[PDB]
Amino acid sequence: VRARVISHALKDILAEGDKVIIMGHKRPDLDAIGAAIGVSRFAMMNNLEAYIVLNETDIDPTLRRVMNEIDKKPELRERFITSDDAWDMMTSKTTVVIVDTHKPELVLDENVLNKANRKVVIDHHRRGESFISNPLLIYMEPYASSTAELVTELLEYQPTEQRLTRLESTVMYAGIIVDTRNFTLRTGSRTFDAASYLRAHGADTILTQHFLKDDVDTYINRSELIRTVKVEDNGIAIAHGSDDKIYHPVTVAQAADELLSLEGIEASYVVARREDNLIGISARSLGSVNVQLTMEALGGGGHLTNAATQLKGVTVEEAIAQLQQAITEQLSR
Amino acid sequence: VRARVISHALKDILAEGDKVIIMGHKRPDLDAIGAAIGVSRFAMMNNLEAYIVLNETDIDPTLRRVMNEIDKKPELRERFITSDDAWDMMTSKTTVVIVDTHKPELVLDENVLNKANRKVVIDHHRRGESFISNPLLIYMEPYASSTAELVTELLEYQPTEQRLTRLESTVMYAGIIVDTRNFTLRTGSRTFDAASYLRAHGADTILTQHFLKDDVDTYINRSELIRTVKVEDNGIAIAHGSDDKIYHPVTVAQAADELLSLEGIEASYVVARREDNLIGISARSLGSVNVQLTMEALGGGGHLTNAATQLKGVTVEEAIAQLQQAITEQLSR
Ligand SMILES: Nc1ncnc2c1ncn2[C@@H]1O[C@@H]2COP(=O)(O)O[C@H]3[C@@H](O)[C@H](n4cnc5c(N)ncnc54)O[C@@H]3COP(=O)(O)O[C@H]2[C@H]1O
Ligand SMILES: Nc1ncnc2c1ncn2[C@@H]1O[C@@H]2COP(=O)(O)O[C@H]3[C@@H](O)[C@H](n4cnc5c(N)ncnc54)O[C@@H]3COP(=O)(O)O[C@H]2[C@H]1O
Ligand SMILES: [Mn+2]
Ligand SMILES: [Mn+2]
Ligand SMILES: [Mn+2]
Numbered sequence: 303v304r305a306r307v308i309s310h311a312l313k314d315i316l317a318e319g320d321k322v323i324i325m326g327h328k329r330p331d332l333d334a335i336g337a338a339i340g341v342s343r344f345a346m347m348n349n350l351e352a353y354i355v356l357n358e359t360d361i362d363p364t365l366r367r368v369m370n371e372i373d374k375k376p377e378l379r380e381r382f383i384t385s386d387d388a389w390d391m392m393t394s395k396t397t398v399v400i401v402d403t404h405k406p407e408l409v410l411d412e413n414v415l416n417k418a419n420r421k422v423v424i425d426h427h428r429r430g431e432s433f434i435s436n437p438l439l440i441y442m443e444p445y446a447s448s449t450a451e452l453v454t455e456l457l458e459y460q461p462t463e464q465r466l467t468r469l470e471s472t473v474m475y476a477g478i479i480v481d482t483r484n485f486t487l488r489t490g491s492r493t494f495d496a497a498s499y500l501r502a503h504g505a506d507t508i509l510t511q512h513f514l515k516d517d518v519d520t521y522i523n524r525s526e527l528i529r530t531v532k533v534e535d536n537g538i539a540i541a542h543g544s545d546d547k548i549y550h551p552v553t554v555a556q557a558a559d560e561l562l563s564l565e566g567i568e569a570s571y572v573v574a575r576r577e578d579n580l581i582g583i584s585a586r587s588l589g590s591v592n593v594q595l596t597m598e599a600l601g602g603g604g605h606l607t608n609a610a611t612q613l614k615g616v617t618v619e620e621a622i623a624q625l626q627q628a629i630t631e632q633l634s635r
Numbered sequence: 636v637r638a639r640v641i642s643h644a645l646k647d648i649l650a651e652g653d654k655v656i657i658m659g660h661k662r663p664d665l666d667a668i669g670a671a672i673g674v675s676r677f678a679m680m681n682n683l684e685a686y687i688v689l690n691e692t693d694i695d696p697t698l699r700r701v702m703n704e705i706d707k708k709p710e711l712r713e714r715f716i717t718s719d720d721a722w723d724m725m726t727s728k729t730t731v732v733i734v735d736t737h738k739p740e741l742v743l744d745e746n747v748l749n750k751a752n753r754k755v756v757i758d759h760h761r762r763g764e765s766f767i768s769n770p771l772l773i774y775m776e777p778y779a780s781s782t783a784e785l786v787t788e789l790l791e792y793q794p795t796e797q798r799l800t801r802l803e804s805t806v807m808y809a810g811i812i813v814d815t816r817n818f819t820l821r822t823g824s825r826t827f828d829a830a831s832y833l834r835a836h837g838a839d840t841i842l843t844q845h846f847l848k849d850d851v852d853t854y855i856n857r858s859e860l861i862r863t864v865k866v867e868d869n870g871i872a873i874a875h876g877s878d879d880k881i882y883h884p885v886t887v888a889q890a891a892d893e894l895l896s897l898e899g900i901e902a903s904y905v906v907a908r909r910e911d912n913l914i915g916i917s918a919r920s921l922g923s924v925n926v927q928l929t930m931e932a933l934g935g936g937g938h939l940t941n942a943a944t945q946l947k948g949v950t951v952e953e954a955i956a957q958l959q960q961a962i963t964e965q966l967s968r
């Protein structure tokens with residue numbers, strides 16, 4: 303009932319203006335792009351004129367493989383425009399739709415946002431300090447998985463003659479896959495309803511897998527860290543890189559995350575040289591062992607399931623020894 | 636749909652008998668068990684009396700984890716009974732329901748099957764040579780993801796007062812996860828519709844991950860194979876173990892599966908010693924290279940995306956040479 307009311311109100315607004323400018327957040331990910339694609343399909347179903355703001359500097363490596371697919375169909379590709387062309391074509395009757403964010407400084411192009419007289423916000427985060435000013439409509443659902451899921455619900459109440467295409471729903475499906483880490487996070491029944499809808503319109507598993515393929519170098523670095531793991535009977539796992547190899551901090555973080563997927567690990571600590579005078583530790587927990595307190599003890603911090611520290615002037619082995627001492631202190635309380 | 640008619644037809648057959656006894660295949664996995672759970676909830680939704688046949692020798696380690704949660708946390712345990720208790724309990728008025736298989740010699744207990752006058756078959760595979768004899772109702776859907784999906788659809792039409800429980804829908808959900816490898820195989824829109832129903836009834840994805848976690852040694856051994864990969868520009872990837880190290884056959888198969896998640900790999904071939912005189916090769920692809928043809932050229936076979944072969948009397952290097960000879964011959968244009 304709620305999405306039906308929101309869907310028709312949004313169609314009223316979009317047809318009420320002179321054209322639709324759709325904008326995600328800075329450095330868009332596949333949920334922002336998929337949501338925007340979904341909103342531009344919302345508009346074409348009602349024969350409206352809609353564009354998505356996207357600059358060349360905005361296209362990261364994951365977005366670039368998606369664009370390589372989008373390039374193969376000029377109708378979809380023609381809907382993408384730059385900040386400048388969006389600015390030049392905007393009037394006081396233009397509706398800007400902000401997808402997958404609600405804070406003016408995270409918007410992909412603040413100047414397009416500032417020129418906008420008519421604004422719409424669709425987002426799935428919890429509202430904070432800053433907010434898009436004077437929105438005509440707000441679709442915010444902090445429990446939903448993604449903005450793609452939200453925009454999918456809106457599509458269902460719109461005319462079906464100009465259906466969502468196979469590539470369009472593949473990108474939207476990819477956004478849900480990324481935001482939920484393939485249905486393991488923030489995933490409810492309505493997430494699966496949206497996936498059902500997208501799948502019924504041709505959303506492609508194999509093309510989604512293509513967008514999200516892992517690099518081979520980084521799989522081999524990550525696994526170099528993982529293979530060293532030692533697990534105590536209490537479920538504490540420790541893994542390390544050698545004292546003379548510098549690991550990327552994202553690789554360390556991913557190793558600590560991936561250890562939680564192995565049997566019998568309640569909490570993971572990955573220790574790897576970050577600079578020549580700096581050792582990094584990434585700590586992750588299933589939710590019972592408190593890795594926040596362990597990292598705080600060593601001069602870092604974070605949250606109970608997700609924390610880290612950096613240690614100046616020690617070797618990897620010294621940082622392991624200092625980490626084990628923090629763990630002992632904390633379990634004897 | 637076929638699903639409305641079968642659900643009401645099934646309910647009548649089950650209510651006409653004196654009680655329901657439910658069996659999957661030997662060495663049940665989570666689809667078998669989850670489908671059998673779903674069928675027992677189907678009966679309870681109509682206040683019929685239902686049991687699932689399960690012996691201690693049927694319970695592999697994955698199933699043991701599920702059953703531990705079924706001891707510590709439900710009253711689900713009461714509906715699991717041994718072969719002997721099933722036999723002692725049934726009359727010629729008892730309906731036996733076979734889930735997730737249709738061959739009599741793969742059924743969990745063939746004597747319970749033979750003593751049964753009233754039989755029902757629910758399965759999602761292609762009907763083969765042998766078949767359950769004189770069944771009262773046959774529900775074969777070769778393209779459904781799983782039997783858990785099929786049974787989930789039947790539940791929707793039944794009275795809702797004795798609702799599917801959280802732990803019941805979690806197991807059913809887990810069976811879909813295993814059969815689809817997390818929604819990457821045989822996943823249609825009806826697959827997600829079933830996942831939506833189960834998640835709405837409390838299916839726990841974190842508990843589902845818990846049931847399925849790989850141990851550390853399997854990751855180490857699996858990544859030992861993955862590190863060796865060589866990717867060709869045509870997307871052919873080959874990896875191999877040393878000739879003097881024996882790998883477990885599933886580790887090899889999992890190595891080949893996981894290489895498809897890496898950039899540039901259309902098809903994977905993992906070559907590793909299985910015995911002192913036998914080399915295994917597991918092959919996999921994202922559907923664009925036919926690895927059934929590659930493995931048929933070396934005395935094995937399988938399906939276009941999933942194949943293998945075993946080679947007598949060769950070294951890993953000899954096996955790799957024959958593998959590459961087969962590949963250049965097959966991919967030469
Ligand atoms: N010295 C210190 N004092 C107090 N608190 C500290 C701290 N160092 C770290 N933290 C806290 O610990 C969290 C984990 O940081 P870590 O370095 O392991 O891991 C980082 C980062 O390496 C990782 N990350 C970045 N990109 C990623 C990707 N694509 N996939 C997975 N993880 C990623 O996610 C985390 C992002 O950092 P974020 O700040 O959100 O979250 C940090 C921060 O909340
Ligand atoms: N000599 C031969 N001649 C003709 N065809 C052949 C053949 N050897 C294999 N095949 C075909 O190749 C498929 C792949 O077997 P593979 O050895 O890779 O790998 C095996 C097994 O190693 C692997 N596997 C078993 N449990 C697994 C698990 N928990 N996770 C991942 N993979 C698993 O799945 C496959 C199960 O074999 P399945 O019969 O379903 O399917 C086999 C069979 O269809
Ligand atoms: Mn985003
Ligand atoms: Mn998002
Ligand atoms: Mn099965």
Ligand SMILES: [Mn+2]
Pocket residue numbers: 666667735759780781782814
């Ligand atoms: Mn099955």
